[PDB]
Prior knowledge:
It is classed as transcription. The first copy, chain A, is mainly alpha-helical.
Amino acid sequence: MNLKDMEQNSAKAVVLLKAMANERRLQILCMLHNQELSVGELCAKLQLSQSALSQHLAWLRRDGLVTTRKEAQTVYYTLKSEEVKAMIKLLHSLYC
Amino acid sequence: DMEQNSAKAVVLLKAMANERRLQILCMLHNQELSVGELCAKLQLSQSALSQHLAWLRRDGLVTTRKEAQTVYYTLKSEEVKAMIKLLHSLYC
């Protein structure tokens, strides 16, 4: 009955939650709120090493929370899933 | 700024990132409940919930109020309350 509906969705929610529950990833996700940024803009605005950033980004990709858009050797990252976009939008209104 | 807030959000996110703990929080949103009532609504025994309720307590996300041998639970966080409402709309 209604037990399983709540069960299956709580599971989907926990999926997004776990993907977001990490300091560096959240900072990155928050920075991509309604905008595209290149590696350079991200490492400077977060004071994160190129390699540290490279790892978190790769991870974010994998979980499909961020996408890319190339350009003469300059790639731009942006949010992907509608769920993270909304949670990020809310997190922004909560701490701003 | 960024690091200070991302840290606070992450702590809330971590407390919510567990199926059972989330269901509990989902039940406690806008309606103080006893353990028995949570058990009834989630169809889980008290012992089955104990580990999750204890976790939610140590993180201050829920506060307990005793009354004539019965313990009542209340969702503390306004940020969590906001996130639960959004989660509800996103998956319901």
